[PDB]
Amino acid sequence: ATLATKKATLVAALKDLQRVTVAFSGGIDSTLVLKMALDVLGRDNVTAVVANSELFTDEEFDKAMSLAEELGANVQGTTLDYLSDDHIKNNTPDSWYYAKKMFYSRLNDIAANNGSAAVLDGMIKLKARSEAGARSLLQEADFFKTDVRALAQELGLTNWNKVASASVSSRFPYGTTLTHDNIAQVMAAEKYLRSLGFPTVRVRFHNDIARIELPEARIGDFLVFNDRVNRQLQSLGFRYVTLDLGGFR
Amino acid sequence: ATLATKKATLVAALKDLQRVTVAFSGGIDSTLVLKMALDVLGRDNVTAVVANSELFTDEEFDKAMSLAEELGANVQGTTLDYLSDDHIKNNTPDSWYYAKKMFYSRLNDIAANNGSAAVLDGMIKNRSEAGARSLLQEADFFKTDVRALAQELGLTNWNKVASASVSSRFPYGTTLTHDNIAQVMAAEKYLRSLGFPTVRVRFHNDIARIELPEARIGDFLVFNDRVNRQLQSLGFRYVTLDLGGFR
Amino acid sequence: ATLATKKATLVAALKDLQRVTVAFSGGIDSTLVLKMALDVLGRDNVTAVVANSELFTDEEFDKAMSLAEELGANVQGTTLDYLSDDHIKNNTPDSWYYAKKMFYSRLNDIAANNGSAAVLDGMISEAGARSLLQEADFFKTDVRALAQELGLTNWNKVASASVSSRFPYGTTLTHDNIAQVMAAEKYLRSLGFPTVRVRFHNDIARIELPEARIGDFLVFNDRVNRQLQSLGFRYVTLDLGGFRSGRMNDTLTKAQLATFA
Amino acid sequence: ATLATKKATLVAALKDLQRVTVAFSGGIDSTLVLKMALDVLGRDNVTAVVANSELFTDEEFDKAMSLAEELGANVQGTTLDYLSDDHIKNNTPDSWYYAKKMFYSRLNDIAANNGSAAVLDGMIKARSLLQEADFFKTDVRALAQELGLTNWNKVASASVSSRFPYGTTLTHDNIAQVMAAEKYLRSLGFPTVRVRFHNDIARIELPEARIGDFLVFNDRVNRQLQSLGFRYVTLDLGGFRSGRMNDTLTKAQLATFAASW
Amino acid sequence: ATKKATLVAALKDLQRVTVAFSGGIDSTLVLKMALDVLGRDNVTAVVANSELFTDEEFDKAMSLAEELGANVQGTTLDYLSDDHIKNNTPDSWYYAKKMFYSRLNDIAANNGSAAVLDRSLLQEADFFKTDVRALAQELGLTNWNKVASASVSSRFPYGTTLTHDNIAQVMAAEKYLRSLGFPTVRVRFHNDIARIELPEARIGDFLVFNDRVNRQLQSLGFRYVTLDLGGFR
Amino acid sequence: ATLATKKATLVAALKDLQRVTVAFSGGIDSTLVLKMALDVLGRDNVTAVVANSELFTDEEFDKAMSLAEELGANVQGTTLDYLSDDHIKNNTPDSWYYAKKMFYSRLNDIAANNGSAAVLDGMIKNARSEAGARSLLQEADFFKTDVRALAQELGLTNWNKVASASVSSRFPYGTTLTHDNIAQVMAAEKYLRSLGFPTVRVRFHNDIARIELPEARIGDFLVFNDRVNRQLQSLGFRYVTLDLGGFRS
């Protein structure tokens, strides 16, 4: 079908819903969904929601809030206590499912209280999403990634989160129990490192050993910082501060 | 003049031409011309043409065909066999002239058969082609004007690195073949895969001479051994780095 | 409160002032101020002023002028001779104040002679400069939201700093040494270093770079050395603390670096 | 006083002892003791013993045996089974003591059977005559030069036990793993190196002055040590002997860090 | 100490001798041990001058033997007069060695020597590299060339004709690179291409010199100046 | 025209002087003179003098003193106040001359008090003339190779291989040397050598330190930038810089 056909389906669905709450992450897909909601229903019938939690950074949160606001949406932050769920706290392969469940349940409460007829996300052409009744309008309208990019150009979208972030749990081996203290340690360490000019970085947690992953093309750049990173990450609680010779991943 | 003034010039020229064929390469300048053609004349009076040849990458071709569809154009690939011209095949200093001639002659045949009033290419201000309209250059667009107008229209996806014909990797007088072209293309592909989007593997028979931007040569050192061994398996005996860098 | 209320304040202030002169630098904030004044008051009740001086580059002047013309404003170029004020020439610690004084006094003279009721700037002043975005309590996020809402996409993304910051307090600025510093920084930017300072210490050039670029710089040491010597420096040096020193240090040595300063 | 006085002290001590056994490691200090012992007492009243064990290299044994012979000493190899002691095998914090005890007890059996009056070793500022004669490190270099000594181990050797955390059991397999990894790194041009063993993590220590040089070897080292059984191959950002070279304030800070474990 | 008698007994028995003196520590050792055992008037040290090795190495060899107290003789070999060497065949090393040893036997026959030493009598005494340091220091020897040289022929492909001009080009290039702090280097000659071999551990250090090295080797006649990613050997 | 002839000249000149004072620096030439004086005149008729001042390090002084005793000489230190001479204090281009003058004048006072017939130094054929100091190696026509030959003949193998430079070379002409800025320069160079850079200079430009390094070492230096910056600031420099021209730029 034509992009025009897929847009028209998307427009009619939003019109039928009147008021919507949008799970906004700042990537191109939820930016497009949010923009179409604003265009079709107006600012007063759309609520953009950005989740703040212990598994993600303040910076990513602040950036999504500012991106939605710059798009012209009324934006709402909401904070989830993911570690209160044992499946997430124990870093299991299904923790991702339970986090999504807690997130979409919080979104339905926001939508119940603001009069929205649905919660919208940015899925394109996933159990917790369906168990919650959140709607993926781009996927119903048969949007593929190139259809998303085409519509965004047509609407003048140029700004969106290009990199998707990974939960801090990926810095810990499966079975290592997530604690408030070890999360903060890893998060302070990655924040200090990003501040030096390394936006793509991981500090993998091996108890007293920090194992730093950098893109190999950047490792030469790092050398002037060895001592300051060593001492800063030791003050965060690591005993040995190391750089993985294999690089990022 | 202002950008608004230059945009209006471009708009009036498109309106006057009614139906157009666009030489589409996927860079910012051809992306801008194609978008403006579509915005002013509509999909049914614009044909985007992407050249498929041995002298540019399959990757570049695939990205350009996908970009033209994403902009909302009907896209047509056209297959050019540049090596069929002896000046190009034997890489004479005149090769550029005959390559340009073969390209613009094919675009004029495509435009004649679909009823277009002109061929459009992406040439800008600061080389001119009688068999095509370079509307950005007629409207006095400079590079900053191209970037400013693209941002104003929401255009974001285009090839950021400028491409050059693979014949530039061979000395004048060296005959280009399917085998030695494939060798050069594979070497540069691997180097690009390591994070060096601007790279040249100049072919000197058994020697590869790699050109990198000087700002990147310090970064390269972590890759020396993998590059050495990979380009040897492609058929080079010695793999080298040019101390003068790219350009 | 809302963007809508803050815009309405700004519109009412512009409407009430009738005719304005705008200090236009080409950044996002003065781009928004100029655009809103044009939208509310019309082309014939707005004068955009772009100042050319020895403390900023001809390139920045040209970019500001074309950006103001691109918005459709009637533009006034004016030249300030900052080195004629002895505090600026001899670079005292309050030197910035007298330059701002000289700048705003010329803008008020322009505004008085064209019938403007105020001079407007892009602040989000001791002589009457009005920052309408700041009275409407615009934050940086509000400026970005309204600019997107009005179709503004083009503005100077890089903020400039007066060339005076390249000279120590007490060193007298001359036409020649300013040109020396400006040429040096331009050459370094041409090598791929957009963020750079060449601090002037008579016969010494002390170069500030972001530390993450110092490793890359090494391939250029000899070319930079010989070029900046040909511009008149006797010694060409690299500051080991980098650009904006202390900013990227650990907690204990960033404390130590700041105590030293 | 002067070197001559300290040499005379040493000569008087050797003459008083008549026959001696020397624990010879090939470093500069034990070379000096052995050369001075031979000069004063003659070949037949000195026995050089080089210890071979599972905690040190075959290189180290062969070089020490070859170096003692080149000085002209009657040299005797002896093999110690350090892993037979549970304190050494299980790498306790005092494991160093039991290794030293077993070594010096074996040396006394050697000395008892040779008619030696004492065992001599290389301690500076069992009998350490260099320490009794007030030899500092600079005194050792000066006397070694005066006597024509040119050949000795430039790199100090440390027992392989130091590559394992306290409490980790040493095995032939993990010992062989650490030694092969270090041999491979020495083969690339890094003679001062340690490969610290943390089960699936290798933590490589290098002199900081060499870490910039290492980058060309990253991928080969990663892959080689993984084939030796490590899952992750890492580089310690503090380097070999961390804190010895830091500025005054960050040496104190790293001291509180180190002392905390 | 044990070895001293073995070497000394051979030299004393071997009449009067001429020693192929290369300037390295051991040709220094053999020459010095030859002098004290057989006396100044019965030893001639010979230093070979040619296009395949450096003038610097030749000049220092002549001073080292003379300051050691030996009668010193320079001799010039025209290796390129031999077609195998001029055309750089894989066996050219063999034909060069023949030329070298035939010239020394002519000198040794002409001055009454009973042999030339480089017979390697120091090797007969089973001296290892460590033995060289012990005896040379022992006799007060402190001056010698520490780095051993390899013939310039190895900088050219097999089959490539050596010329006076190509050699000087290669030799000035390597000399300039050594001047910059890279004592171990080869500039392999590929007509218009220079391919520089460095120990891989030094390639990072080289970067500060890229542009000066590029322009300098171009002024010596190269069109392209490159660095071999595989490193030295 | 031979070595023995040059040796004999030196022996005859020493024998004629009976008792001597030797300006001893530890280099090979003053080592040779000292050894020959002892060999020819006996220990009781040679005084080796090592100058101690603010223009060189305690470490350099200690090394010359110990090298002289290792030769078997009676050695005596003497302390010079070079900063008392305004040519030295204000670092004019003529400063080297007045330091040498002050040095050779003190050596004459020692030699008068111990009954020496001359002051000996190590100048060879390859301020002093105005003082009556004799360069016997230079009168006997010793070239550098002659010195090396005789040192070998006498078994001398130990001497300072590294040539020292007066701390005056760290200051621009016209800059006044003080006890404090000298100590500042020497502390900075000491720290830099301790990091593995034996060939280094910290050039003094008031509040700016300009470090000169051999260019082949600058890439290696980067791992130490921040520690060097902070250490030399703690010594009193405001700005710590690296000369892009390298050592002896």
Side-chain angles (χ1 to χ4, degrees), chain A residues 1-58 61-125 128-144 146-148 150-161 163-249, chain B residues 1-99 101-124 129-142 144-159 161-247, chain C residues 1-14 16-58 60-62 64-99 101-124 127-147 149-156 158-246 248-261, chain D residues 1-15 17-18 20-42 44-62 64-66 68 72-99 101-108 110-112 115-136 138-140 142-145 147-243 245-261, chain E residues 1-2 5-6 9-10 15 18-32 34-37 39-40 42-55 57-59 61-65 67-118 123-125 130-131 134-136 138-140 142-144 148 150-233, chain F residues 1-18 20-58 60-62 64-124 127-128 131-143 145-147 149-163 165-249:
Chain A
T2 303
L3 192 83
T5 325
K6 311 192 177 185
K7 192 192 193 194
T9 316
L10 171 58
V11 167
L14 290 153
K15 260 176 201 166
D16 288 340
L17 284 155
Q18 307 201 100
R19 286 163 314 270
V20 293
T21 306
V22 186
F24 185 71
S25 74
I28 192 180
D29 300 320
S30 68
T31 294
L32 176 63
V33 162
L34 179 54
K35 176 66 179 163
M36 286 296 316
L38 289 164
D39 276 4
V40 170
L41 315 166
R43 175 186 198 122
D44 293 316
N45 304 308
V46 176
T47 300
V49 167
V50 174
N52 187 240
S53 74
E54 266 186 300
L55 302 192
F56 298 91
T57 76
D58 290 341
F61 171 81
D62 292 335
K63 184 50 171 175
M65 293 277 288
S66 70
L67 283 173
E69 188 171 330
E70 289 170 14
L71 250 202
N74 299 317
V75 70
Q76 176 175 338
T78 192
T79 89
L80 299 149
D81 178 13
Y82 286 132
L83 288 201
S84 82
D85 184 313
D86 275 349
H87 302 99
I88 309 177
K89 166 144 36 82
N90 293 325
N91 200 32
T92 325
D94 47 16
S95 305
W96 178 230
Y97 166 60
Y98 289 91
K100 221 89 169 211
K101 171 181 290 307
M102 169 163 348
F103 176 73
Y104 282 113
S105 152
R106 155 78 34 91
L107 275 166
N108 285 126
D109 296 336
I110 292 166
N113 275 278
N114 74 27
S116 297
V119 178
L120 307 194
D121 67 18
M123 309 293 100
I124 66 178
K125 215 74 172 199
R129 186 214 62 182
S130 280
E131 321 190 336
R135 307 266 310 269
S136 295
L137 295 187
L138 291 183
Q139 172 185 23
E140 306 175 359
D142 268 285
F143 271 77
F144 287 83
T146 175
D147 294 331
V148 165
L151 189 43
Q153 183 281 287
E154 182 204 301
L155 311 167
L157 312 172
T158 55
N159 204 9
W160 59 76
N161 231 308
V163 74
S165 38
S167 166
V168 80
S169 46
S170 65
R171 282 67 155 175
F172 302 84
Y174 280 138
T176 299
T177 290
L178 300 195
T179 66
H180 300 304
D181 285 349
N182 65 16
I183 283 172
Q185 188 174 339
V186 173
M187 291 256 271
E190 298 197 358
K191 177 167 180 206
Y192 175 66
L193 287 175
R194 287 195 308 276
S195 88
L196 303 174
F198 302 94
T200 309
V201 66
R202 302 268 190 287
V203 185
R204 311 278 191 206
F205 179 96
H206 295 269
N207 308 122
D208 55 343
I209 296 175
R211 169 169 68 76
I212 298 168
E213 287 178 21
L214 281 174
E216 288 197 81
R218 294 313 294 300
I219 288 181
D221 299 318
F222 203 66
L223 177 74
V224 79
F225 299 114
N226 281 11
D227 172 71
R228 286 169 276 186
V229 171
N230 184 40
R231 276 175 312 100
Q232 180 72 7
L233 268 56
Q234 290 193 22
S235 80
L236 297 171
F238 287 106
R239 177 178 188 186
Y240 303 107
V241 185
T242 76
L243 191 68
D244 191 321
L245 297 182
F248 184 66
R249 300 294 170 62
Chain B
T2 67
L3 189 63
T5 290
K6 305 185 171 171
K7 196 183 165 179
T9 313
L10 171 55
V11 160
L14 289 155
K15 283 178 159 141
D16 193 76
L17 288 174
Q18 306 200 48
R19 169 162 302 176
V20 301
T21 308
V22 176
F24 188 65
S25 73
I28 196 179
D29 302 321
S30 147
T31 296
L32 173 61
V33 165
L34 179 54
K35 178 65 181 349
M36 282 303 285
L38 287 164
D39 275 7
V40 167
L41 313 175
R43 176 191 268 272
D44 291 335
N45 304 309
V46 174
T47 319
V49 162
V50 176
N52 178 48
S53 72
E54 244 184 302
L55 303 191
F56 296 86
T57 65
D58 292 347
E59 166 171 8
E60 254 186 271
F61 174 82
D62 295 338
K63 282 163 166 2
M65 296 278 291
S66 169
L67 178 54
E69 215 159 282
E70 180 176 299
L71 292 168
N74 300 130
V75 202
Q76 177 178 341
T78 190
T79 305
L80 294 154
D81 181 9
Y82 287 124
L83 288 199
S84 77
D85 182 309
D86 276 349
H87 300 96
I88 308 175
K89 169 137 194 123
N90 293 323
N91 204 34
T92 58
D94 296 331
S95 305
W96 70 272
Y97 169 82
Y98 294 92
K101 173 163 72 153
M102 169 165 350
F103 179 83
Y104 281 105
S105 153
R106 156 82 39 96
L107 272 164
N108 282 116
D109 291 1
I110 291 165
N113 284 289
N114 60 41
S116 292
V119 185
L120 307 191
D121 67 19
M123 312 291 109
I124 57 148
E129 249 320 299
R133 299 284 293 280
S134 310
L135 296 183
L136 294 177
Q137 166 190 286
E138 307 180 0
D140 301 318
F141 273 76
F142 298 98
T144 173
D145 293 329
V146 168
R147 298 189 322 254
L149 188 46
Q151 193 50 31
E152 167 183 318
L153 310 166
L155 296 174
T156 48
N157 204 14
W158 59 75
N159 206 321
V161 179
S163 154
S165 160
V166 83
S167 44
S168 68
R169 282 69 158 178
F170 299 85
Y172 290 137
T174 301
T175 292
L176 280 56
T177 69
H178 303 304
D179 286 353
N180 66 16
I181 285 171
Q183 183 172 334
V184 172
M185 290 284 203
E188 298 195 356
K189 176 177 244 229
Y190 177 68
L191 289 172
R192 287 196 310 276
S193 92
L194 300 177
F196 301 94
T198 309
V199 64
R200 303 272 192 287
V201 183
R202 311 277 194 204
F203 179 96
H204 293 272
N205 304 123
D206 54 341
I207 290 177
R209 169 169 69 76
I210 301 165
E211 288 181 22
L212 283 176
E214 286 199 80
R216 297 311 293 301
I217 287 180
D219 302 321
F220 199 67
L221 177 72
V222 80
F223 297 111
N224 281 11
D225 169 69
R226 287 169 279 188
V227 169
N228 185 43
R229 282 172 22 234
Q230 183 77 14
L231 268 57
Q232 289 188 16
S233 82
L234 296 172
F236 290 108
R237 180 179 191 188
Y238 305 103
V239 187
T240 73
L241 190 66
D242 189 322
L243 295 180
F246 178 63
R247 286 292 172 270
Chain C
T2 72
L3 191 72
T5 66
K6 314 181 142 155
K7 185 170 135 131
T9 315
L10 162 61
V11 158
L14 286 162
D16 166 81
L17 275 167
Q18 307 203 256
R19 185 173 277 158
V20 304
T21 306
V22 181
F24 182 68
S25 73
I28 195 180
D29 304 324
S30 69
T31 294
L32 175 62
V33 161
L34 178 53
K35 171 66 179 162
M36 285 286 305
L38 284 166
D39 276 9
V40 167
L41 304 187
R43 183 184 204 282
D44 294 319
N45 304 306
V46 189
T47 305
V49 172
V50 173
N52 185 237
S53 67
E54 267 182 298
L55 301 191
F56 297 88
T57 58
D58 291 341
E60 306 153 87
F61 174 78
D62 290 332
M65 291 278 291
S66 72
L67 286 164
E69 291 154 359
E70 193 56 61
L71 282 163
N74 187 28
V75 175
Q76 171 103 15
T78 195
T79 292
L80 294 152
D81 178 53
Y82 284 130
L83 288 198
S84 81
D85 183 315
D86 274 346
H87 301 180
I88 311 176
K89 165 145 189 80
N90 292 327
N91 203 40
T92 41
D94 47 17
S95 160
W96 67 272
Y97 166 61
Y98 293 74
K101 170 182 232 96
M102 177 167 342
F103 175 76
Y104 283 115
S105 154
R106 155 82 40 93
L107 267 76
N108 286 307
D109 184 274
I110 291 165
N113 171 72
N114 73 25
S116 297
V119 175
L120 305 189
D121 66 17
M123 289 276 297
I124 79 191
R130 286 274 292 276
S131 315
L132 293 181
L133 305 171
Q134 163 189 281
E135 309 175 0
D137 297 301
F138 270 72
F139 304 133
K140 169 186 121 256
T141 321
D142 292 331
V143 166
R144 304 219 109 92
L146 188 44
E149 195 194 280
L150 309 165
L152 302 180
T153 49
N154 205 10
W155 55 78
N156 225 286
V158 48
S160 67
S162 161
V163 84
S164 292
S165 69
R166 281 72 159 180
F167 300 82
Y169 291 132
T171 298
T172 88
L173 291 59
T174 72
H175 306 299
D176 288 350
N177 64 16
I178 288 171
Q180 189 176 339
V181 171
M182 294 224 283
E185 298 199 356
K186 184 164 180 207
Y187 173 71
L188 287 174
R189 285 194 305 273
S190 93
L191 298 175
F193 300 96
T195 310
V196 67
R197 302 269 192 287
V198 179
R199 311 276 191 205
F200 177 96
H201 298 273
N202 309 320
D203 53 342
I204 292 175
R206 169 172 68 76
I207 302 168
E208 288 179 21
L209 280 171
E211 288 198 81
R213 294 311 293 300
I214 288 180
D216 300 316
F217 199 68
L218 292 199
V219 80
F220 297 115
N221 279 13
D222 170 68
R223 287 169 274 191
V224 168
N225 182 41
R226 271 161 16 208
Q227 176 78 13
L228 270 56
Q229 290 189 19
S230 81
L231 295 170
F233 290 107
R234 179 179 186 190
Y235 305 104
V236 186
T237 74
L238 190 67
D239 188 320
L240 298 182
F243 182 66
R244 271 50 207 279
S245 168
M248 272 170 16
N249 268 52
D250 55 290
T251 299
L252 189 79
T253 71
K254 142 142 72 183
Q256 172 190 58
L257 277 174
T259 284
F260 288 177
Chain D
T2 85
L3 180 66
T5 320
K6 302 177 169 169
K7 180 172 165 176
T9 317
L10 186 85
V11 160
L14 287 165
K15 285 212 264 257
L17 276 158
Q18 309 209 48
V20 280
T21 319
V22 294
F24 183 66
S25 71
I28 194 179
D29 306 307
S30 70
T31 296
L32 177 62
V33 162
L34 177 129
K35 173 65 179 162
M36 290 290 308
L38 287 166
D39 277 8
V40 164
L41 305 168
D44 314 296
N45 310 299
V46 202
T47 44
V49 48
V50 171
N52 188 338
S53 75
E54 304 185 301
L55 301 193
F56 296 84
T57 310
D58 285 343
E59 212 140 42
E60 277 151 2
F61 176 80
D62 291 334
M65 293 273 288
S66 169
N74 302 315
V75 62
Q76 178 172 336
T78 195
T79 300
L80 297 119
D81 179 15
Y82 289 131
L83 289 200
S84 78
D85 181 318
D86 273 349
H87 300 100
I88 308 177
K89 171 89 170 157
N90 293 325
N91 205 37
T92 45
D94 48 16
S95 160
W96 65 271
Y97 167 28
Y98 292 100
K101 170 183 287 204
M102 170 166 353
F103 177 75
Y104 283 108
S105 155
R106 155 80 33 93
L107 268 164
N108 283 306
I110 296 263
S116 300
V119 181
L120 308 190
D121 66 18
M123 317 280 262
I124 64 157
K125 303 246 295 187
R127 298 258 262 140
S128 320
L129 300 174
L130 292 193
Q131 168 187 300
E132 310 177 0
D134 261 39
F135 278 74
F136 282 91
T138 199
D139 293 331
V140 174
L143 189 45
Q145 152 77 84
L147 314 166
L149 300 181
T150 51
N151 208 12
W152 61 80
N153 296 330
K154 275 88 193 134
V155 183
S157 202
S159 162
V160 82
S161 294
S162 67
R163 281 70 154 179
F164 299 82
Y166 289 140
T168 301
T169 325
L170 302 210
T171 68
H172 296 126
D173 286 349
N174 62 15
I175 287 171
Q177 190 179 339
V178 171
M179 287 190 165
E182 295 192 353
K183 180 166 180 206
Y184 176 70
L185 290 177
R186 288 195 307 274
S187 88
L188 299 176
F190 301 93
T192 308
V193 69
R194 305 268 192 287
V195 175
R196 311 277 190 205
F197 179 97
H198 295 271
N199 309 323
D200 54 343
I201 292 176
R203 170 173 68 81
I204 300 166
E205 288 180 23
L206 284 175
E208 289 197 85
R210 296 313 295 299
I211 286 181
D213 303 319
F214 201 64
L215 176 74
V216 80
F217 300 114
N218 279 10
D219 171 65
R220 288 169 277 190
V221 173
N222 186 43
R223 280 175 316 103
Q224 180 75 12
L225 270 56
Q226 286 184 15
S227 82
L228 294 175
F230 290 108
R231 181 179 193 190
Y232 305 100
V233 183
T234 76
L235 191 66
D236 191 321
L237 292 181
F240 180 65
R241 290 292 174 268
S242 147
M245 277 179 311
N246 268 237
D247 66 282
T248 302
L249 176 83
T250 70
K251 163 62 192 196
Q253 180 196 48
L254 272 164
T256 320
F257 286 161
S260 58
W261 320 88
Chain E
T2 62
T6 37
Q15 313 242 345
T18 37
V19 277
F21 184 68
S22 70
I25 191 182
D26 303 284
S27 69
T28 297
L29 174 157
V30 165
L31 178 52
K32 176 66 178 162
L35 283 161
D36 52 15
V37 168
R40 172 180 196 146
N42 318 316
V43 309
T44 325
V46 157
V47 176
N49 177 237
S50 73
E51 267 183 298
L52 301 192
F53 300 89
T54 40
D55 287 340
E57 177 190 318
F58 172 81
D59 289 336
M62 295 274 284
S63 272
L64 174 44
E67 99 187 0
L68 253 197
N71 302 127
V72 152
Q73 184 172 161
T75 189
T76 46
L77 295 151
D78 177 15
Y79 286 122
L80 281 77
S81 81
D82 179 314
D83 274 347
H84 301 99
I85 309 175
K86 169 90 169 156
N87 294 326
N88 204 35
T89 86
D91 49 17
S92 71
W93 68 273
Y94 169 61
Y95 295 89
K97 274 294 204 201
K98 271 188 17 202
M99 256 172 64
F100 176 77
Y101 284 107
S102 155
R103 157 81 36 92
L104 267 76
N105 283 121
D106 285 353
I107 293 167
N110 206 342
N111 58 38
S113 298
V116 317
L117 297 325
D118 58 15
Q123 170 189 331
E124 309 172 359
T130 63
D131 291 334
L135 189 43
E138 207 206 51
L139 314 171
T142 88
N143 208 9
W144 57 79
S151 163
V152 80
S153 292
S154 68
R155 282 70 158 175
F156 300 84
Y158 287 140
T160 297
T161 323
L162 298 200
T163 72
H164 308 302
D165 287 348
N166 307 344
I167 289 172
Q169 188 177 337
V170 170
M171 292 227 308
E174 298 196 357
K175 181 159 179 217
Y176 174 69
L177 287 173
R178 287 196 309 277
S179 89
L180 302 177
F182 302 97
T184 312
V185 64
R186 304 269 191 287
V187 316
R188 312 278 192 205
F189 179 94
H190 298 272
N191 304 123
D192 55 343
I193 294 176
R195 169 170 69 78
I196 298 166
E197 285 180 20
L198 284 176
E200 290 196 81
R202 295 313 293 300
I203 288 182
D205 303 319
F206 203 69
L207 178 72
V208 78
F209 298 112
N210 279 10
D211 171 70
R212 288 168 276 187
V213 170
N214 187 42
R215 282 173 318 104
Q216 178 77 14
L217 269 54
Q218 288 189 17
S219 81
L220 295 168
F222 293 107
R223 182 181 192 191
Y224 305 106
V225 184
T226 74
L227 191 65
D228 189 321
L229 297 182
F232 178 65
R233 290 240 192 82
Chain F
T2 88
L3 173 66
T5 282
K6 308 205 195 110
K7 186 186 192 337
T9 315
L10 165 72
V11 168
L14 284 166
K15 258 182 207 159
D16 172 78
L17 288 153
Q18 308 205 97
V20 294
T21 306
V22 176
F24 183 70
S25 73
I28 191 181
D29 304 333
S30 72
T31 296
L32 176 63
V33 164
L34 179 52
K35 173 63 179 160
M36 286 270 91
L38 287 169
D39 277 8
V40 170
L41 298 176
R43 170 189 253 273
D44 281 339
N45 307 310
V46 202
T47 323
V49 165
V50 173
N52 185 22
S53 72
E54 266 180 299
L55 300 190
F56 297 85
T57 59
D58 292 342
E60 287 161 339
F61 169 79
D62 293 335
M65 292 276 290
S66 69
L67 278 175
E69 29 196 274
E70 279 161 25
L71 279 172
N74 185 30
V75 68
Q76 101 174 53
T78 195
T79 295
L80 296 150
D81 177 14
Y82 288 133
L83 291 198
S84 78
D85 183 315
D86 278 349
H87 293 97
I88 309 175
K89 170 142 194 81
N90 294 324
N91 203 34
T92 73
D94 295 334
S95 161
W96 67 270
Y97 170 60
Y98 286 75
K100 284 282 116 171
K101 167 190 288 305
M102 171 167 315
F103 173 67
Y104 280 102
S105 154
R106 156 83 39 95
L107 275 163
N108 284 120
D109 284 333
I110 295 166
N113 276 116
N114 64 31
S116 300
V119 198
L120 304 190
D121 66 14
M123 314 291 105
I124 67 187
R128 183 232 72 207
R134 305 269 309 273
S135 313
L136 299 185
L137 293 181
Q138 171 185 266
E139 306 177 358
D141 292 312
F142 274 68
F143 291 95
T145 199
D146 292 332
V147 168
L150 189 43
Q152 166 278 112
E153 181 182 298
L154 308 166
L156 316 177
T157 51
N158 203 11
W159 58 79
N160 281 322
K161 265 90 183 169
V162 280
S166 160
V167 84
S168 291
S169 69
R170 281 71 161 180
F171 298 83
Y173 289 142
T175 301
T176 287
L177 288 59
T178 72
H179 306 302
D180 286 348
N181 61 18
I182 285 172
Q184 188 175 338
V185 169
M186 284 173 28
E189 296 196 355
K190 176 171 240 229
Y191 177 69
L192 286 173
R193 288 196 307 274
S194 89
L195 300 176
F197 303 91
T199 313
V200 66
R201 302 266 190 287
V202 189
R203 310 277 192 205
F204 180 95
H205 295 273
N206 310 123
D207 55 342
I208 291 177
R210 170 172 69 77
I211 301 165
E212 288 182 20
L213 280 175
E215 289 196 80
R217 296 314 294 298
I218 289 178
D220 300 317
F221 196 67
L222 294 198
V223 80
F224 299 114
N225 278 10
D226 166 70
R227 288 168 276 188
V228 168
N229 181 40
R230 278 174 313 98
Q231 179 75 12
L232 271 57
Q233 292 192 22
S234 83
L235 292 168
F237 288 105
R238 178 180 188 188
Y239 306 107
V240 185
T241 75
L242 190 65
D243 190 324
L244 293 180
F247 182 63
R248 289 239 190 81
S249 76

